[model samples]
Target: LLNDEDQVVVNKAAVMVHQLSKKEASRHAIMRSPQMVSAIVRTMQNTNDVETARCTAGTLHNLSHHREGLLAIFKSGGIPALVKMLGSPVDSVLFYAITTLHNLLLHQEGAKMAVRLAGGLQKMVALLNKTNVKFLAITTDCLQILAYGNQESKLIILASGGPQALVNIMRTYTYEKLLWTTSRVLKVLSVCSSNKPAIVEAGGMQALGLHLTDPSQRLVQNCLWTLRNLSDAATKQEGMEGLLGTLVQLLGSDDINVVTCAAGILSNLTCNNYKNKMMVCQVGGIEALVRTVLRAGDREDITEPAICALRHLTSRHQEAEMAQNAVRLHYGLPVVVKLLHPPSHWPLIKATVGLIRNLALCPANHAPLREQGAIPRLVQLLVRAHQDTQREGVRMEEIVEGCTGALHILARDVHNRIVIRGLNTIPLFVQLLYSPIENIQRVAAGVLCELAQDKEAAEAIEAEGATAPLTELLHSRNEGVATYAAAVLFRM
Candidate 1:
C-alpha cells in the first residue's frame, strides 16, 4: 500500500503505520525493516501530499521513542524531510514535524548536528516571532533542547536572533506557560558570553528582572538564574535601581537556590565597578552578605559567590580605603579570617586568601589580621600543599601563588615579620623560589628578602636550601625577579 501509485493509498498506509507505531510494543517490528523507514521518509518529502506528510511525520514521532526506531529514522532520509515540512502551510503537518524533531533531538546527539546542517534553527527561530501561541511554545521547546549543552547550536540560534525574538514576546504577552518556557530557553542560551548582545538588546534583563518576585516560585527562581548569567554584562544602574536590594534581600532568607544566584548576580555587579560596589555596600548588601557567608558555613554554593562579592567590594580600586573600612567597621575581618582553615575549597580558597590580602590594602586592617591567627592558617594552606593531591583541577600552583602573594603583602607590616618566621614559612618560601610562574618566584624572593633582613630567619632560608635558587634567580630575565633576588642576597 505504501508503494501504491495512488496518493490516497499512500496517505492511508502512513496513517495505518501512525496508529500501529503509536504503541510502545509495536515500534520494534515496524521500524525493523529499513524499507519501511525509507518508505515513510520518501512519502514525507512530497509537500503537495499534505495529508501523507502529516501522517508519516506523526508515525515517525511515535517510532522515535524507542532507541532502535530513533536510530532508524535518522539513518534513513527522515531528518531532512521533516525539516522541509517545517515550512508546510498546514499547521497539522507542522505540529507533527516539530513534535517529531524535538523528541529526536532529546535522545540523539547526532540529530542536533544534522538539524543544524539542515538549517533547522533558521526555521525554528522565525517561528518565535510568529503570532500563534501554540507554535511559539513548541518552537521554544525545540530551541532549548538544541541550546542545552550543544555549543554549536547555541551560537547558531544566537546569530539568528532567537534570543531577541524570545525576549520580545515575554513583553508582548502575559501567558504564564509561554513566558516560563521562553525564559528557560533564554536561560540556556545565556550560557555563552557571545549570546549577551542578542539577549541584552532585546530587553531581556528588564523582562526577566521584573519577574524576580513572580508568584510562581519556579519562574522567580529561573529569573534569578537567568539574571545571574546576565549579571557580568549588566549595567551598574541595574543594582542601584533596586536589583541590589532584591538580591540582597534574597541573601538573608530565601530558597538556597535563590540565595546563590542572587549572590552570583551581586558578585558580578560589584566586580570592578566601584559605584556599584558602593551601592552594594549602602543597600545593606555588606551586612546581608556578611551574615550570608557565616550562615553558609559548609555550603560551597553560597560561600563562593558571597566571598567573591566581598573581595571585589574591598580590593584595590578608587574607593579603596573607604570600602576596606566598611568591612572592618562591620567586624568582617575576624569573620573572614575564620575561613583560612587550610581553606581547601578553591575559588573559596583563592578569594579568601585574596580578601585577606586585599583587606590589608587599607593599611588599617593589618593590625587586626596580624594578631588574629592569619599566619597559621596560611601556613596550614601550604603544609597541605606539601602533601599534594589529584592535581586534575586542584589548581595547586595557583593556591601556592595566592598564599605566597598574600604572605608577602602581610609581611609589609613590622610586627608581622616575627610571626612569619616564627611560624616557619622560610622553607616554603625557598621551595617557591623555584616555581615555574614568574610572579610566584618574584613574591617568594620579595618575602624571603624581608625575612633575610632578620638575622636567624635569613640563615633559616639558606638552611632550607634557598642558597642556589636565590643565586640562579639573580640572572633571570624578569627585571623585578632579578632585583628581588639581588636584594635577598644583599640583605644576607
Candidate 2:
C-alpha cells in the first residue's frame, strides 16, 4: 500500500498506519519492515498536499515513540523530511512535525544535532512567538529536548535572545501544560551562565517564584529548580520578597525531592545576602531546616542539602549566634550526629562535619552537641580515616579537618578535653600531621596544641610518636601550622 502509484492510495495507507501505530505490535511491525520506512519518507516527500504530509508525519510521530522506529526514521532521512513540514500553514501538520522531532530528539545519540543540522533550530525559535497554544507547547518541548545538556544548542538559543522571550510566554499563558513546559525549558536555560542574567532582567525570576505554590507538584518542581539556578541572582537584586516564606512552607513537603530542591535554593539565596540571611530566620527558616535535618534518616540527598542550608542560616551574619542556638533548641543535634556513622558518602560527611564545626565555633552548641553524642562519632571519623583512605580511597581531608576543627573548638573547655583524651584520640592526631591535605595537617597541629595543655594527653602524644611528624611539620610552609607545631613541642 505504501508503494502504490496513486497519491490517494499512499495517503490512505499512511493514515491507516498512523491509526495502527497507536498500538505497540503494529508500530513494531511497521518499523521492522526495512524498505518500508524509506518508502514512507519518499512517498511523504513526493507530495505537496497537507493531508499526505500530515498523515505521514502523524504515522512517523507515533513510530518515533519507540526506539526502533527512531532508528529507522533517522536512517530514511525522516529528520530532514520532518524539518521541512514545520513550515506547513496548518496547525495539525506543524503539530505532527514538531512532536515527531521532539520524540526523535529524545534519542540519546546524535539526534539533538540531527534536528539542528536539519535546520530545526531557527524554525523552532520562530514558532515561539506564535499565539497558538499548541504550537507554543510543542515547539518549546522540541527546543527543550534539543538543548538537553547539548552546550552548542544552549549557546545557539542564548545567542538568539530566545530564552529571555520565554518569560513573556510564562506570563501570557496561564494554560498549565505550556507554563510547565516553559518552566522546564527555562530551567535548562538557567544552567547557561549568560542566560541567567537575561532571564532575571526580563522578570523571569519573579515570574517563576510566583508558581512556587502552584497546584501541579511537577510544575512547582520545575519552577523551584529554575528559581534555584537564578537564586544567586535573586540575592544580587531586590524583588525577592515573600518567596522565602513559601520555601519554608515547602520544606514540609511529603515528596522528599520537592523538599530538597526548595531547601537547596534557600541555601544559595543565603550565600552572601544579609537581607536573605535575616529573612530566612524571620520566616521560620531555621526551624524548618532543623526539622528537615532531623527527619533525613539515611537520605543523603536531603541530609547534605538540609545541613548545608542549615549551615548557611547559622553562620556569618548578625543573627548567626542566635540561629546556631536555634538548631540545638530545635533538637537538631541527634539527626546530624547519627549521619556521622556512614562516612562512606563524602558529600554528606563533609556537610555534616562542617555544620558541626560551625555550630561548635562559639560556646553556644558544645554541651548540647556533646550530650547528643557528637564527640564519639566525630572521633570515629578520624580513627577510620586512615583505614578508609588506604582501602576505599575516600578524600579524607575535608572530613578530617572538619571533625578536627570542631573537636578543637569543643576541646577549649576542660570537660570536653577530658572526654576526647578518654576516647584515645592522640594517635589519630599524630596521624593527621602526615595526612595529604594541608589544612588537615595544619588543623591537626592546632588540635594537638589544644590537647598538649593537658598533662595526660601530652604524655600520650609523646608515647604515640607524634613529635617526629610534629617536628617535621615545624618547617611547614603554612605559618599557623609552624606556630601550632612549635607550641605543642614546647609543652613537651
Candidate 3:
C-alpha cells in the first residue's frame, strides 16, 4: 500500500491518515514523514474525488494545529486547494475545507490569502444563511477567525451585507452555539468603525439585547462583547441606553468577565452623555458600580470600568457627595489610593483623584484619606508635578490641578495640614506658583495658604521664597489666585 499507484489505494490511505492524525503520536509520525504530508496534499488537490478530498481536508485540519504541520501544509501548496474546496456543495467537504482553512488562517499570511481568493469571503458570507444549523455554526466560527483583527476581511464582510446577515441570523437563531458564533462574528465586524451603523441599522442592538437575559453564559458574554462595541456609536446612544437596564443587572454578576463587560458598556454609554448619567443612577447603576469596585478592586478588568462609571456618575455636586459616602461606607479609600501609584493610567488616575477631591470636601473623609496615606501620595504627585515643571503638556497640567485640588480639600484638617507641611510640600506648592498655567497657580496658592495657616509653617513657606511668587500672583486676574496669594502673604 505504501507504493500503491492505484487512486483507490491512495484515497483509502488518505482516509487512514485522517483517522490516524486524530492522535498526537500518529500526527507526529505523519509530520515526521515529508512524503506523508506531500501525499495528503496531493489527495487534497483531487477536486474530482470528494471523499478523498474531504478526508484530506480533515487530516489537514488536525495537522494545522501543529507548527510543523502548518509549515508542511503551506509548503506543499495545500492552501490554494483548501481555499478551492470552500465552494463545495457537500457539507462534509465544505466543513472540513473551511475548518482546515480556519486553522490555516491562524497565521497572518493565511488570513490575508483567504481574503485574497476571489469571492472567498463573499462565498462564506453566503453560506451563513444557506447552511444547516451545524454547518452554519462551523461557517460562522470559521469567519470569526478570518475577520478577527484583519481590516480588509472586516471591510469585505461589511461590504457583502454580512453585518445585516449576521443580525438576521442572531434574530432568527435561538440555538446557543449558532447564536454565540454569530454574535462573535458581529462583534468582530463591530470593531470596524464603518460597520457599526450598518449593524445598528440591521437591528443588531435589539437582537443582542434579547440575549442579555439568556441562560447560557457564552451567549450572554458574546452578546455583551458585541453590545460593548455597539455602545461606542453616537448614533446608537438611545439604543444602548435601552440595554442599560440589563447592563445594570449584569454589573451584579458573580462572573468577573460578565461584570467587566457590563461595566465597560456602561462606561462607554455614559461617557459625556448627561442623559445616560441620570438614567444609570435611576436603575441602581451607581450602587452596582460602587459594589463592583469594592468586590473587584484587585482586578483591573473589573475595577477600571467600575471606577470609570463611578467617575462619570459623580460629576454633579449632589452625585459626587453620594459617591463619596458610598466609598466611605465600603472603606474604599485604600482601594482608591492603590490606583494612584506612579505610572498610573491617566484616565483612571484622573477620575480616582476627582472622586478623592470630591470626597475630601467632606471633613469626615479627610482623616480617612490621611490615614490611608493619601497625603503622602498627593505630595509625591505634587513633587512629580514640580519635577515636570520644565515640561509642557496638558496631561501634566491636569495631574497638578487634580492633585492640588485634592490637597486643598484635604488640608482643611489641621492635622492633615501638619502632616503635609511636615512632608515639605510647601516648596512644591511655591514652585507651582511659578507655572504660567493659571489653574495651577490658583490651586498652588490655595494649598500654600492652607499650609501657612499655622504660624510655624510660615517660616518654611518664606524659606521656600514664597513671597516673590505670592507678590506676582497678587496681580493675577483670577480672583481666587489673588485672594489665596494675599492670604499666604498676610500669614507670612
Candidate 4:
C-alpha cells in the first residue's frame, strides 16, 4: 500500500504506518526498512493531501523517538521538508512539524540542518511574536533546541529581537507554561554576552525579579536562572534597588538549589562593586551569607558564592570593620580559614584569601587571624606552585596579591611581623618584587615597607638581596610601588 499508485490508498497506508510506529515492535521494523522510510517521507511531501501530510508528519514525529528513524529522516531529506512545513496555517501540521524538528534537533546534524534552513529560524522568531500562546510556547520550545550550543542560532535570535519578544511574552502572559518556556528561552539567549544588556533593556531583569515572589518552584527557578545572566550587566544601583534585598532573603531559602542560585546571583552582583557590597552589608546580607556558609560548610555550591559575598562585603574600607565584626562575632573567620587547606577548589581559595585580606586591614583582628593559624596557611599560598609541572603554575596570582595585602596588614603588629619573619616569608616577598605583574610587585613592596619597620625584618630584607629589586621598583611606573619601594629602602 505504501507503494500504491492510488493516492487515497497511499494515504490510508500512511495512516496505518503512523499508527504502527506508535507500538514498540512495528516502529523498529518500519524504521529498519529503507523502503518504508523512503515511502513515508515521500507521502509527507505529497502537499495535495492534508491527511497524507498529517499522517506522514505524525509518523515522522513518532519515528523521531528512535535513533534509526532520526537518521532515516535525515537521510531521506525529511528535515528540510519538515522545516518547509513550519509555515502551515494548520495548528496540527505546525505542531507536528515543530515537534519533529525539535526531536530531530537532538542530533548534531539535525541542528546543523536547522541552522542552514533559509527562513526556518526567522519563522520561529515570527511565531514567537504572535499572540497565540501555544505557538509561542512551541516555537520557544523548538528555538530552545536550535539555539543550544549553536552560536549562529543564538546570534540570529538576538539580531531578530528574540529576547525582546520573549520579554513581551513574559509581560503579556501570566500563564505558567508560557512563563516557564519563555524564561527557558531567555536562559539560552542570555549565554550570548551581547544579549545580556538587551535582556535588561527589554525589562527582562525586573520582570524576572517580580516573579521571585511566585510560590512555584519551577517558575522561580527559571526566573533566578535568567537573573544570574543579567546580573553581570546590572549596575550597582540597579542591583541594589532591584535585586539586593530579595537575593539576600533568598540566601536563606529552604530549597538548596534556590539557595545556590541566589548565592550565585549575589556573587555576580557584588563583584568589584564597593557601594553594592556596603549596601548588601547594610541590609544584613553579610549575616545571611555567614549563615549559608556555616550551614553549607564544605558544599562548593553554597560555600563558593557565600564566601564570595562575604569577600566583597568585607572588601571596602567602610564595610571592612563591620564585616570583620560579623565574621568574628559569628566565628566565621575560622571556617573561612579552614577552607584554605588541602583539596580546596581554586575559586574558594581565592575568595578565602580576599576575605582574610580585608579582615587583616584592622589592627585588632590581626591577633585572631594569627591565632587561627591563618599566617602559616597564607604563607603556603604565597609560594605554592602547581604540583603538575606540565601545568606550569597555579592560577592563584589574585590569591597571592591578597596574601601580600593581608601580610602587609599583619606585619604592622610588631609581634606578628616577627612571627611572619620567623616563617621565612621575606624571601617569597622579595621573589614577588621581581614578579612581571606590577600589582604583585607593588603589594610585595608594601609588605616589605611594613616588615622593614622592624630592624630584624629590615636586616632579613637586605639579606635576601632586596636592594636590587627595591631599586628596580623605584623606577616602576606605578607611583605607589615607587613610593613604597623608596620607603622600604629608606627604612632599611
Candidate 5:
C-alpha cells in the first residue's frame, strides 16, 4: 500500500516498522531485506526535515550491524545523506549519524563501499585536518573506531590523507584526555595490518610509548590495552622490546585490576611467539614479574593478581631460554618456594608452584628451579597440605587449586621434572587417591603418571613407598582413583 506520494509500505499492518525492520535486519539471513532497507535509505535521502532523515538513518544503523544488509544501504545513497547530517544544527543527531556511518565503514565490504559510494574516508580525514581542535578531537575519535578491526579500513583512511593529519594532531594535542585518546587511536592503527608500517613511519611507537608511563591511569590503561593488541602477533620481530618494557611497567602497576589485565595481555602478547620469548628475556620481563610476585605475596587480596601475572609471564617461552636471563632465577623460584606453606593461600601457593613447575620443566629454567629448591617444596605441598587447609577460604582454595594445577602442568614438561627425579610421589599420590574431592585425587594421579614415565620412579615406588598407601587406596570407595592407582602401580 502506498503510504505517501512516493513511499510504499510493503508490510502495511506493521506499526513501528522502522524498529521491526531494523531488528529483523540485524540477523544474518534477513540482512538482505532490500525493500525494507531501500525504504529507509530513500526516506533518509528524500525527507526534508533533517531530524526525520537522521532518525531513518539510525534505523538503518541498527539494521546494518550485520554485514549482510550493509552494502544495500550504501547502494541506496545512505552515505551522502548521513554525511549531509554532519552539517545539521542538532549535535546529537549529527553525531549519531556520523558515528553510525563510521561504524559501518569499519569492516571490509562496508569500508570499501563507503570509500567508493559516499566519499566516507576522505571526508573523515578532512574533518581531522580542520583547524578546529575540538573538531579534530571528535574526528580522531571517529577515525579510531573506523580503524580498529581491519587493514582495509585503515588503508581507506591513509589513502584519504588522514594518517599525516593524525600525526600532526598528535604533535599538537598535549592535554591529557586529548593526548591519551590520540595515542589510543594510534595504538589501534599501529596494530591494524595496513596501518602498522605507516604507524612506524610516523614514529607512532615512540609517541605512543611516551604516554605509557603517564601519571594518568586512563592514558596508561588504554595505552597498555591497545599496545597488547599491537604486540600480540606470532611473528613479532618489529616492536617486541617496546611492548615488553611497557608491559613490564603495567605488570608492576599498583592497581590489582591493571595487574590482572596486564597479565592477560602478556599471555596473548607472549603466547606461541618465539621472538617474544627472547624479547622478554632481554628487557628483564622476568625481573619485573618476579617483583610483582614478591610484592603480591606480602598481602592476601593482591596475591591472585600477582599469581595470574606470574602464570602468564612464566608460561610457554620463559623456561626455554633461561640461561640467557639468569637474573630471572633469583626473583621468581624462591618466592614461589616460600609460598608452599600451611598459612599460604592455596591459589597463591598453586600459582607459585605452577610457575615453578612451568619454569623448571624448561631445560634452561629447570636447573635454576632445582638449584633454588623448587622440587622439595612441590613434594612437601603435595604430601602435607590438609584437605581442609586447601578449602579454608576462597583465597586459599584458589591458590591451592592453582598450585595443584601447576604441578600437573610441570609434570608434563621435561625441565621441571624435579617432581619426578627428587621425590617419589607415588605413595603420596596413592594416599590422596581416596580423597573425596576428585580434583585432588586426579592431580595426584597425574603426578604419578609423570613419575611413572621415569624408570627410577617405578624403582623407587617398588622399594618402600609402596608399603601401606598403595594397597589401601585400592580398597577405598572411590573407584576412579583406585583404578588409576592400580593401573599406575602395575606400570611401575
Candidate 6:
C-alpha cells in the first residue's frame, strides 16, 4: 500500500534514526523493524545518488549498536556495501561509512574479515596518500581502527604500504588528531608480531620518542602504552634500555594521569635490563616516583602506579646489575617517608611504608631509610592503621577498608618497632577500635600483637579499650578477619 515516495521517506527516516541514536537503550527499537533495516541496506546498494547512499550507510552504522544489530549488518553483507561508499565524492558519506566500518569491526571476528575484505586495511593508506583527505580526524580514526584490526589485516595493511602512507599523512596533519593517531597507530603496529620491526624500520619508535613532549596527555599515554608493549617483546634487553632516558623525561609531566601511565610503563619496561634500570635511576626516576607517591596520596588512581614504580627502583637484582646512585637514595627515601604521614589512606600509605620496609629489609638500603626518617613514618602509619577493603572503585566503604590494609602491613614489618612504640602508638590504635568496618578492628588487633612484645605497648593497648573490638572481631562472620584477630589476641 505504500507509495514509492513513502518508501523513500521511510528509508530516509531510518537513515535519520541511524544518525541520531547515540544512546544504547533506544537502539533496540530501530533494530526491531526489519523493514527499515532492509530498506537501509537496499537503498545503499541501489542508489547511485551518493548522498542518499551515504545516508543509507550511516543509518546502517547507527543500527550497529549491539550484538544483534552488528550481526544484521554482517548477515546482509552490509560491510562490503559500505566499503564501496568509501569512494564517494560526498565526504560526509565517506566519513560516516568509514566510521561505520570502524565501529562495526571493533568486535574480534568482524574486525578481521571485514577489515581485509573491504580493502579497509589498504584503503586508509591509499586514501591518505592519494586524496589530501584534509579531514585528518576521520582519516586518523579510520587508521586507528584499521591498524587495531587483527594480525592478518595488519599484515595486509603493511603489505599494501600503510607505513609510507602514515608518514605522508604525518607531514600533512601536525596537530591534535595527528598526534594521537600517530601514537595510536604505532601502538597498534608495535603489538603486531610481524609489523613491530617494520614500525622500528620505518622510524616509528624514534618518531614517537621525538613526540613524547607533544603536550597531549592522550598522545603521551598512547605512546607510553606502545613503548611498554614493544619493550616487553625484546629479544635483547637493549630494546627497552634504549628508551629509558626519554621515558624518564615523561615521568616529570604535571598531569597526574600522564605521570601515572608513564610510571607504569617504566615499571614494566625496566623489568629485565640492569642498565635500563640504572638509566631510570639516573634520570631521577626514583625521586620523581617518590614525590608522585607523596603528592598523589589519597588520589587512589595515581598512587598505585607511583608506588609500583618506586618499588621497582629498589630491586636487588637491579642493584646488583646496575650501580646504586646517590640521587635514588637521597630523593626517594625522603619522599616515601613524607607519604607515610597521616596514613589514613592505607593502600597508598601502606604501599609507601612497605616500600620503606622492603628498602630497610635490604642491608644496603637500611641505613638510608633510617637516616631519611622513614622508620618513624612507617611505624606511625602502621601501628594506627586499619584493615583494607577487598572491593574496587571509590565507594565510601572502600576508602575506609583500603586504609586498614595499609596499617596491617606497616605493623607487620618487624624491623620498625622503635617507630611503632614512639609517641604512644597503642592509644592511637585504641581510638580506631570504634570503626564500623570489622577489617579495621582486625588490623588494630594485629598492630596490638606486634606492639604487645613491648611492655608499655602491651599495657597501654590492654588498658586503652582494645578488648571490646578484639571481642567483636572474634565473633565476626568473616573468617580471615577472625583468624588474624585470633592470632593477635593469642600473642597478647
Q: Which stretches of candidate 2 lie over 4 Å from their true place?
A: 1-115, 130-134, 148-152, 188-206, 227-238, 268-275, 342-346, 390-394, 455-475, 489-492
State residue 458's C-alpha deviation in candidate 2, in Å.
4.5
Question: Considering lDDT, where higher is better, how would the candidates rank from best to worst?
Answer: 2, 4, 3, 1, 6, 5
Tens-place lDDT digits, model 5, residues 306-379: 55445555555535446223435555656666666657765566656655655554555556655676666766
Candidate 6 at 216: error in angstroms? 5.6
**Candidates' TM-scores?**
0.71, 0.73, 0.65, 0.77, 0.47, 0.47
- TM-score: which candidate is best? 4
Q: Give per-residue CA lDDT, model 1, range 163-228, as digits (tens).
A: 779888877866677778888888898878788766876778777876776677877788888888
Query: Model 3: runs farther than 4 Å from truth?
Result: 1-116, 123-139, 196-207, 228-236, 338-351, 361-367, 370-373, 388-398, 411-423, 436-439, 445-492
Backbone clash pairs for candidate 6 read: 346-403, 386-404, 387-404, 387-405, 388-401, 388-404, 388-405, 389-401
Candidate 3 per-residue C-alpha lDDT over 1-492 given as tens digits, one digit per residue, 9 for 90 to 100: 143122545466766777878989878777767777777777767646778777778888888888878777777777777767777767788888777666666663554464456456887887777747777887788788778878988898888889888988887878889999998899888878888888988888878988999999888988888888887744644555557788899888888788889999888877777677777877777677877887875577777777877777666644556656666776677778878885456677777787788778767788889988998887787678667756532476788888998898888899999898888788778888998899989989998888888888888899989999899999999999999999999999
Off by over 4 Å in 1: 1-120, 131-135, 145-155, 170-173, 192-207, 229-245, 268-279, 342-347, 386-391, 452-475, 486-492
lDDT of the candidates, in the order given: 0.79, 0.81, 0.79, 0.79, 0.60, 0.61
Q: How do the residues 218-272 of candidate 4 rate in per-residue lDDT, one tens digit apiece?
A: 9999989888888874654453455677889998888998999999888888888
Model 4 TM = 0.77
Lowest summed lDDT window (length 10), candidate 6: 1-10
Pick the lDDT winner.
Answer: 2
Model 1 local distance difference test score:
0.79
Please list the residue runs of candidate 6 whose C-alpha ends up more than 4 Å from where it truly belongs after superposition.
1-139, 143-176, 182-207, 215-218, 225-242, 294-300, 317-331, 341-350, 361-368, 371-492
Residues 125-240, candidate 2: write the lDDT tens digits.
Answer: 87788898877988898888887788788888777767767888987887789999999889998988888878888888778878888898888989988987887645375766
Which ranking of candidates, highest TM-score first?
4, 2, 1, 3, 6, 5
Off by over 4 Å in 4: 1-118, 230-240, 317-320, 383-393, 396-399, 463-465
